[PDB]
Design a protein around this ligand. Structure first.
Ligand code: CLA
Ligand code: CLA
Ligand code: CLA
Ligand code: CLA
Ligand code: CLA
Ligand code: CLA
Ligand code: CLA
Ligand code: CLA
Ligand SMILES: CC1=CCCC(C)(C)[C@H]1/C=C/C(C)=C/C=C/C(C)=C/C=C/C=C(C)/C=C/C=C(C)/C=C/C1=C(C)CCCC1(C)C
Ligand SMILES: CC1=CCCC(C)(C)[C@H]1/C=C/C(C)=C/C=C/C(C)=C/C=C/C=C(C)/C=C/C=C(C)/C=C/C1=C(C)CCCC1(C)C
Ligand code: SF4
Ligand code: SF4
Ligand code: SF4
Lengths: 80, 732, 107, 161, 42, 90, 139, 30
């Protein structure tokens, strides 16, 4: 699977989760940012590696970071 | 599900990508699962013994196929007229016209004519018969077996070297300088003095008589008295017929300089004295480092103490010792940069100063050897920068390298890269502009208007070495000079004869075309360096991707965000610079070959007038010399240049097929493949057969590599077919 | 059959006047391959004066089309229901444009 | 002479270049009548060819064995009109363009919207700047020394490495 | 003259094309009156 | 990544002072600066003499003048050592 | 909670873009939603289908195929009633989306953060530091 | 010229080299 990380520079804008086509990311409560929430990745096995979450990230360096790793049928986007 | 046993991430991939990536990552032992440093160095050691053996099997094969199928004994009788045979052809696809067309070489069977020069090398070093070529092939088969057993043996538990052994820098340097470089150069002098020198003079010396046949009539008594100049007395006469006793001297060590007048090669006594000198020098250099007896240098102490007190290099080389030793990629990069410069020296000094008898009249061999070693040079130099990029990504620790030369190179990475960008642009704009100026003015019927700039600096260098063509009267060219007087009693008479005579490639005449092409090569070397240096320096990060190090050396991209990140990896700057390497070695070998074929006709002025504009390069080199090559077969028959005629088209095909992988990218191909997966599953009588691995399109990095390999292979096969067939078909 | 068509002459500037080659008919110019000479002979022009009148007719049409584009965007722009008349447009482009085009050209 | 070259005025190969270049045009002129426009054009081309070769012969250029002028660019003052002096003219114009553009980008930074000044150029101000370039070596060296050309290394964005 | 038409003529492509046409035009005129200048004459 | 070995007796030679410590001279660490400066001038004169006397090289050069000609580059390292020893108070 | 296998499906005239043998041998995805109307939507795998008024059931080969229909149904027809399931060939039905009844874009209690790194991205360890040791590059 | 027996000696030594190559490749592969 791919490995998806969220760094503590996340402002909790929820945009990376909305971008996610594969329900990899979700919002959890976090007191670090003003929004009271940070992104989380409890479903990186469904991560295809599209990196749409990275594009939606408005932080200077993407708080969400996809690291392409081992490929599976799910992470390869194979309908066969 | 278990082929990449070194990679569980690939061994669980259900696609065809697993096979490709397991094949492509097989030799990257550092990335293998559960890899310790002990096991890494011990597998590299054993696989270095396997490379040693492959080289020896390759050389034994060349010797065996020439001993068996070649015409070596016919060639040594008459080396200027007989064409050397590489090996025979047994091809069941041949027609009888093809069988007849390849039956040259004075034999009764189809053959390939050797362009490798191994006949001239084996002739020069002593080999006379097929029995000793075969004996050499046998000895190399034994040595290949010895190094295969050594590779297996040093994988056994008691014979496994420790990491303390693998990083003993001082003992390895002492032994490689004094034993591997120096003593084997001294032993090579012994081979020349004991075998090659007597057999160049008609007297056979083999293992059967070499302890009862003295190389010198006096014989090891002048050496043990200090009367060393008695070994230079009575050199080979200018009437010497190589291989025979007539005109032969008794000297075994000389500094005559220039060339043997018949073979047009360097004197073998000069070569024997060269390896004796360079041997003693390297042996002395191999006593530099402290190993076990308290004399010598510690490499750590030398590197730590070389920080200039002005502070301009920062901490200097503090910590460079550890970085080099711990980083196999830093060592590979130093080794490959060093080796690439040498095989460029090999290419440049072997055409201008040939050592082998009757080569430099084998124009095909000279062209093939120069082209071969320059392409090897470009590959080694690009790989050196590649492994410097891999060093920065994988082995470079900034905390261990604080304010070093390495940190301070990264600190000004933008000054280095932007000034390489400037010099590349500078040279490119002007060199192309002068070339286009020349093309436009010649096209408009006004060749005089051409901007022709004489290569005065290089001509001054030629004159400084004794060329009298330009009338500089500098150093050796001036008869009454300190430099000229000093070498007059030793090497200058021969050198002046060699340099001034126009029958050799030593300091070939240079004019405006030479200037323009040298500037083109400067643009190419600077631009390949720009791409490679930009890749190495930005390997660990950039404004576009600050954490690039975390992704590795070879990754596809960071996605379409931040504007687009295609070809952002350091591997992708290797990939892009590989085209620039091919382009520069193209410019170098096109220049070398065109200048030499024009000189070899006796028509050097045709290069002098046509090389200053690009249509001269197109019509007078590529189009004019294509005609023997592309007529290797036609509707009127075929000749022995048909194979190069087929290879030339084969290179054009591979090269163009590479464009498919480089222009068309993955999403198109994955959508084709999904329709093929649908079609196979829906076709009756065919859906009984199922793939074990799901067919996927090639990866982004893999297709860049596949297109690069196809481009490169097409480049090599096209030019090899051209440089060999045009020179063979023309013979001049 | 002997003179080569040429309708482009270069200025002598940087030696480029070599491009005014000897195309024939006491003339130097760039040989043209667009087949206009054969079109004009097929039209029956047989005079350079009539080619000047055709150049003026093209110039007048060019002015009328650039005026019509300005007029039909800025002064009188048709509504969408005008453009969505495919039957009317096809009737006029078959009958009027192509049909009277062929009829007038045949005439 | 220099580098074994011959002055173009006494080299026979330059003279045969001129003679062949004039013969090519004279055989093109041999197919036209005297007053016709192609003949007049061809004769002016012959006159230009003769003027070019006549000027090059008396210029101190050095010809090769091929009869074409060669440029000596090692720095010698007897040949400074081929690279050193044209190069000084270039560097003056190039530094002019560079100083003028640099002055305009520094002006445009102090604008209400800096990026409109670079796609819609303030032409009176930019023409004031194009007039500034005639004394760029002094203007730029005083700019350099007064700490206004070079910004310090800690005011420049760099990659983490 | 209209200020918006002058602001249009101050746009980057118009000034670029006019300035490089003026530049090209005096290179052409200088090579017309004084052709074949391979060297600075001295 | 693993301990990198160095020969026994390897000591620290990184310096940021005016001169390196005399330990960078190895076996010449205890030699006085006057002794290096005099050895340096002596080596420069005898090396230059021995070099000069065999500049037209013959097939019979004097081996002592060849060996003595090696004192000229050796004199360079000697005066660098002289500078290091004077700036260490030796 | 569990997938009612009897839910009627949208009216699709079939397509070649649907699922292949890996759906019946590895995994299949299902998406259900309630529609207020008998309305035409676009299939992720091809042409157009008609979702029925009431509850609809779909069988797709990918979770992205399911979530693509989910976005089309939420942005054009305003259905927020979509549940995405992964059905194993064994017959096990795995509920996927939204995983805890609340959309991922909305915070929910009892969600534990996975993948969260306590420092910013420039404080990642260099690869040389993590070489020949199992220690992770995220500090 | 090379005898058939000489070629057979070369083939014997290359077979010994093949066996040692197999043994090294298996050892490197583990
Ligand atoms: C019989 C009438 C008629 C004619 C001749 C045309 C002709 C044309 N229409 Mg059409 N059009 C018509 C009716 C007509 N339209 C109607 C009724 C509608 C409404 C439904 C449209 C809607 C329409 C649209 C929406 C578009 C056109 C376009 C075009 C042009 C196509 C490009 C081309 O080949 O031009 C080259 C051929 C020529 C002959 C150029 C001549 C130009 C004039 C206008 C032709 C007629 C001149 C005059 C009638 C001749 C008098 C003869 C006299 C000397 C005796 C062409 C000028 C397209 C276009 O390019 O827009 C400009 C376009 O987008 N038309
Ligand atoms: C005298 C002692 C000695 C000698 C001879 C060698 C020899 C060798 N060692 Mg070394 N080694 C030694 C002691 C020694 N070792 C010690 C003491 C240690 C421990 C501290 C090591 C530790 C060590 C390691 C860790 C490794 C080696 C390796 C090697 C091999 C290098 C690969 C090769 O083919 O290069 C051959 C190089 C040359 C022949 C010289 C290069 C010539 C230059 C490049 C240009 C000259 C061009 C010239 C004209 C040639 C023309 C040829 C002709 C066609 C014209 C080589 C056989 C490596 C290897 O492959 O393992 C088997 C390796 O990994 N050694
Ligand atoms: C003929 C083929 C060709 C040419 C000319 C270039 C040219 C260049 N390459 Mg490219 N390249 C090519 C093929 C080519 N490449 C291929 C096949 C590859 C493999 C992918 C690469 C990969 C590559 C990389 C990876 C890099 C380059 C770089 C460079 C530059 C190196 C020379 C330089 O710095 O200044 C020479 C400049 C020129 C030759 C430009 C010509 C000047 C123009 C034509 C002026 C003309 C003006 C005219 C009026 C325009 C009319 C337009 C009209 C519409 C009005 C230059 C832009 C390097 C670079 O950018 O370094 C700074 C670099 O990093 N190239
Ligand atoms: C930075 C650009 C550059 C580069 C990489 C090279 C590279 C090379 N040159 Mg070229 N050369 C250059 C600029 C350059 N040259 C210029 C501007 C001139 C004057 C026209 C020459 C004239 C020249 C000759 C005559 C010869 C070479 C040769 C060579 C080769 C050997 C090394 C040498 O002589 O360097 C030459 C290095 C320099 C001249 C210094 C370059 C550094 C500066 C920055 C260049 C810019 C200077 C500036 C534009 C002019 C000064 C102003 C002046 C008008 C007052 C090598 C291919 C030789 C060769 O192999 O030809 C076969 C040779 O004989 N060069
Ligand atoms: C980039 C666009 C382009 C350009 C520059 C040219 C340039 C040229 N064309 Mg070509 N042409 C093009 C596109 C283009 N063509 C296309 C797309 C078509 C298909 C309709 C044609 C069909 C075509 C024909 C049939 C002829 C030319 C001719 C010519 C030459 C003379 C120009 C002229 O006055 O034509 C004048 C055209 C004529 C005198 C004959 C016109 C006959 C056609 C059938 C009229 C149809 C008009 C009608 C409005 C088309 C509607 C499209 C239809 C499908 C509804 C010149 C080389 C002529 C040539 O090569 O002579 C040497 C010629 O006979 N062109
Ligand atoms: C790459 C090597 C190289 C370089 C960088 C130069 C650079 C230079 N040469 Mg040298 N030259 C070279 C090789 C080289 N040359 C070679 C190989 C030859 C052939 C023998 C010559 C022969 C030559 C001659 C004969 C002369 C030069 C002169 C000059 C200078 C030109 C004008 C100048 O600045 O004067 C200084 C002027 C100013 C600073 C201001 C003036 C306004 C310049 C320093 C000229 C010179 O001045 O000599 C010092 C000169 O007379 N050159
Ligand atoms: C006049 C403005 C200007 C100035 C002062 C500079 C200054 C510089 N540039 Mg250049 N550059 C410019 C515009 C300018 N740039 C533009 C518009 C482009 C896009 C084509 C580039 C592209 C560029 C590259 C690709 C490189 C440089 C490099 C450099 C540096 C080396 C100097 C050099 O050789 O220039 C070289 C100049 C060029 C290659 C392009 C010249 C572009 C034209 C001629 C200038 C534009 C004129 C401008 C429109 C003036 C309008 C002002 C007016 C309204 C008053 C230096 C920092 C090099 C570097 O980093 O080395 C250290 C380098 O590699 N620049
Ligand atoms: C030009 C480079 C260079 C320099 C600066 C030095 C400098 C030195 N060497 Mg080294 N050495 C060199 C090249 C060099 N060597 C080479 C090429 C060899 C191979 C023959 C040696 C082999 C060598 C040995 C074997 C020893 C030295 C030693 C020394 C020290 C001797 C001081 C002395 O004579 O006291 C007055 C000094 C630090 C000695 C030492 O202690 O090393 C640190 C020592 O034992 N040298
Ligand atoms: C890339 C590669 C992979 C893995 C790593 C690696 C090991 C380091 C590397 C090395 C690869 C290497 C080094 C590969 C080496 C491959 C080699 C050396 C292959 C040699 C084959 C020789 C044969 C089959 C001859 C057989 C002769 C016969 C049967 C004659 C028999 C007989 C005749 C007639 C006469 C005598 C009697 C009999 C006995 C009857
Ligand atoms: C990218 C990268 C990242 C970090 C790690 C890394 C691998 C190290 C690195 C790679 C770096 C690489 C790939 C570096 C490549 C470096 C190279 C190719 C350096 C070439 C050096 C050649 C020199 C200094 C020639 C000197 C000749 C001289 C002095 C001749 C003198 C003369 C003599 C004697 C005779 C003639 C007269 C004259 C002219 C006087
Ligand atoms: S987008 Fe970047 S910032 Fe906005 S939530 Fe996802 S991670 Fe945090
Ligand atoms: S990569 Fe595509 S899938 Fe993986 S998390 Fe970012 S968005 Fe969701
Ligand atoms: S195009 Fe291919 S490479 Fe370029 S960004 Fe999108 S994916 Fe990465």
């Amino acid at each position: 699977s791919h490995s998806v990380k969220v760094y503590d520079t996340c402002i909790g804008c929820t945009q990376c989760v909305r971008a996610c086509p594969c329900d990899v990311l979700e919002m959890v409560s976090w007191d670090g940012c003003k929004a009271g929430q940070i992104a989380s990745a409890p479903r990186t096995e469904d991560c295809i590696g599209c990196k749409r979450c990275e594009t939606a990230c408005p932080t200077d360096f993407l708080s969400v970071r996809v690291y392409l790793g081992g490929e599976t049928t799910r992470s390869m986007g194979l309908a066969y | 599900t278990k082929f990449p046993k070194f990679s569980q991430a690939l061994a669980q991939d259900p696609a065809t990508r697993r096979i490709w990536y397991g094949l492509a990552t097989a030799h990257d032992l550092e990335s293998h699962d559960g890899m310790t440093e002990e096991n890494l160095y011990q597998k590299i050691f054993a696989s270095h013994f396997g490379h040693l053996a492959v080289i020896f099997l390759w050389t034994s094969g060349n010797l065996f196929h020439v001993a068996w199928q070649g015409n070596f004994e016919q060639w040594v009788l008459n080396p200027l007229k007989v064409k050397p045979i590489a090996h025979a052809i047994w091809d069941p696809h041949f027609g009888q016209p093809a069988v007849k067309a390849f039956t040259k070489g004075g034999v009764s069977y189809p053959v390939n004519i050797a362009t490798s020069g191994v006949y001239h090398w084996w002739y020069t070093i002593g080999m006379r018969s097929n029995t000793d070529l075969y004996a050499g092939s046998l000895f190399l088969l034994f040595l290949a077996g010895v190094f295969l057993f050594a590779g297996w043996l040093h994988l056994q538990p008691k014979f496994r070297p420790g990491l303390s052994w693998f990083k003993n820098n001082e003992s390895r340097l002492n032994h490689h300088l004094s034993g591997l470089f120096g003593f084997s150069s001294l032993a090579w002098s012994a081979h020349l003095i004991h075998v090659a020198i007597p057999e160049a003079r008609g007297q056979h010396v083999c293992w059967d008589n070499f302890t009862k046949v003295a190389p010198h009539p006096a014989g090891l008594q002048p050496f043990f008295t200090g009367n060393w100049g008695a070994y230079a007395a009575s050199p080979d006469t200018t009437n010497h017929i190589f291989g025979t006793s007539e005109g032969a001297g008794t000297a075994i060590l000389t500094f005559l300089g220039g060339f043997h007048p018949q073979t047009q090669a360097l004197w073998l006594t000069d070569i024997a004295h060269h390896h004796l000198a360079i041997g003693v020098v390297f042996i002395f250099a191999g006593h530099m480092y402290r190993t076990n007896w308290g004399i010598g240098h510690s490499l750590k102490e030398i590197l730590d103490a070389h920080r200039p007190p002005g502070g301009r290099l920062g901490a200097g080389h503090k910590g460079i010792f550890e970085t080099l030793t711990n980083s196999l990629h830093f060592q590979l990069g130093l080794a490959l940069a060093s080796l690439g410069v040498i095989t460029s020296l090999v290419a440049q000094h072997m055409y201008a100063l040939p050592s082998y008898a009757f080569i430099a009249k084998d124009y095909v061999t000279q062209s093939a050897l120069y082209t071969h070693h320059q392409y090897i040079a470009g590959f080694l130099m690009v790989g050196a920068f590649a492994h410097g990029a891999i060093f920065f990504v994988r082995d470079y620790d900034p905390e261990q390298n604080k304010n070093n030369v390495l940190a301070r190179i990264l600190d000004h990475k933008e000054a280095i890269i932007s000034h390489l960008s400037w010099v590349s642009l500078f040279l490119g704009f002007h060199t192309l502009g002068i070339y286009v100026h020349n093309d436009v003015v010649v096209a408009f019927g006004t060749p005089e208007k051409q901007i022709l700039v004489e290569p005065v600096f290089a001509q001054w260098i030629q004159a400084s070495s004794g060329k009298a063509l330009y009338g500089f009267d500098v150093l050796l060219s001036s008869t009454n000079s300190v430099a000229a007087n000093a070498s007059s009693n030793i090497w200058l008479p021969g050198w002046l004869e060699a340099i001034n005579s126009g029958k050799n490639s030593l300091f070939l005449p240079i004019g405006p075309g030479d200037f323009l092409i040298h500037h083109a090569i400067a643009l190419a070397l600077h631009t390949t360096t720009l791409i490679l240096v930009k890749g190495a320096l930005d390997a660990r990060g950039s404004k576009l991707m600050p954490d690039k190090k975390d992704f590795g050396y070879a990754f596809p991209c960071d996605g379409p965000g931040r504007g687009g990140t295609c070809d952002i990896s350091a591997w992708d700057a290797f990939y892009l610079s590989m085209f620039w390497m091919l382009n520069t070695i193209g410019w170098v070998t096109f220049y070398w070959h065109w200048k030499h074929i024009t000189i070899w006709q006796g028509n050097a002025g045709q290069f002098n007038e046509s090389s200053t504009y690009i249509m001269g390069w197109l019509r007078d080199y590529l189009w004019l010399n294509s005609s023997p090559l592309i007529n290797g077969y036609n509707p009127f028959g075929m000749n022995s240049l048909s194979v190069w005629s087929w290879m030339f088209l084969f290179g054009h095909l591979i090269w163009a097929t590479g464009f498919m992988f480089l222009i068309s990218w993955r999403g198109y191909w994955q959508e084709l493949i999904e329709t093929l997966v649908w079609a196979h599953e829906r076709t009756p009588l065919a859906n009984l057969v199922r793939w074990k691995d799901k067919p996927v399109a090639l990866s982004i990095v893999q297709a860049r590599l596949v297109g690069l390999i196809h481009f490169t292979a097409g480049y090599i096969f096209t030019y090899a077919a051209f440089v060999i067939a045009s020179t063979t078909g023309k013979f001049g | 059959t002997a003179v080569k068509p040429s309708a482009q002459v270069v200025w002598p500037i940087v030696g480029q006047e070599v491009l005014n080659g000897d195309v024939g008919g006491g003339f130097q110019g760039v040989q043209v391959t667009s087949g206009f000479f054969q079109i004009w002979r097929s039209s029956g022009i047989t005079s350079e004066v009539e080619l000047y009148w055709c150049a003026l007719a093209g110039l007048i049409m060019s002015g009328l089309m650039i005026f019509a584009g300005w007029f039909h965007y800025h002064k009188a722009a048709p509504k969408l229901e005008w453009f969505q008349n495919a039957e009317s447009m096809l009737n006029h482009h078959l009958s009027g444009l192509l049909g009277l085009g062929c009829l007038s050209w045949a005439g | 002479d220099v580098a074994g070259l011959t002055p173009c005025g006494e080299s026979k190969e330059f003279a045969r270049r001129l003679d062949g270049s004039v013969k090519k045009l004279q055989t093109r002129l041999s197919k036209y009548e005297a007053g016709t426009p192609p003949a007049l054009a061809l004769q002016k081309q012959i006159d230009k060819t003769k003027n070019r070769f006549d000027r090059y012969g008396k210029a101190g250029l050095l010809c090769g064995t091929d009869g074409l002028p060669h440029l000596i660019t090692d720095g010698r003052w007897t040949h400074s009109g081929e690279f050193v002096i044209p190069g000084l003219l270039f560097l003056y114009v190039a530094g002019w363009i560079g100083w003028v553009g640099r002055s305009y980008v520094l002006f445009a930074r102090t604008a209400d919207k800096p990026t409109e000044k670079e796609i819609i150029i303030d032409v009176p101000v930019a023409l004031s700047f194009v007039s500034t370039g005639f004394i760029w070596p002094f203007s730029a060296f005083k700019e350099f020394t007064s700490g206004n050309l070079i910004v310090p290394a800690d005011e420049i964005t760099v990659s983490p490495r | 003259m209209d200020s918006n038409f002058l602001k249009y003529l101050s746009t980057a492509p118009v000034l670029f094309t006019v300035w490089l046409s003026f530049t090209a035009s005096f290179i052409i005129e200088a090579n017309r009156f004084f052709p074949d200048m391979l060297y600075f004459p001295m | 990544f693993s301990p990198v070995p160095s020969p026994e007796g390897t000591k620290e030679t990184y310096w940021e002072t005016k001169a390196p410590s005399s330990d960078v001279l190895g076996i010449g660490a205890g030699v006085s600066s006057g002794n290096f400066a005099a050895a340096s001038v002596f080596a420069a004169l005898v090396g230059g003499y021995c070099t000069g006397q065999v500049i037209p090289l013959t097939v019979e050069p004097n081996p002592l003048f060849l060996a003595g000609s090696f004192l000229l580059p050796y004199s360079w390292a000697l005066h660098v050592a002289a500078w290091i020893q004077k700036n260490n108070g030796k | 909670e569990t997938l009612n296998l009897q839910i009627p499906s949208p009216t699709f005239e079939g397509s070649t873009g649907g699922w292949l043998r890996a759906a019946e041998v590895e995994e299949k995805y299902a998406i259900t939603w309630t529609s207020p109307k008998e309305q035409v939507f676009e299939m992720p795998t091809g042409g157009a289908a008609i979702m029925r008024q009431g509850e609809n059931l779909l069988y797709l080969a990918r979770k992205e195929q399911c979530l693509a229909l989910a976005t089309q149904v939420k942005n054009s027809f305003k259905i927020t009633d979509y549940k995405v399931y992964r059905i194993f060939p064994s017959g096990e039905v795995q509920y996927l989306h939204p995983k805890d009844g609340v959309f991922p874009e909305k915070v929910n209690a009892g969600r534990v953060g996975v993948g969260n790194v306590s420092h910013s991205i420039g404080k990642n360890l260099n690869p040389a530091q993590i070489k020949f040791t199992s220690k992770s590059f995220n500090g | 010229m090379i005898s058939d027996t000489q070629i057979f000696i070369a083939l014997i030594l290359a077979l010994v080299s093949l066996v040692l190559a197999i043994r090294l490749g298996r050892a490197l592969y583990q």
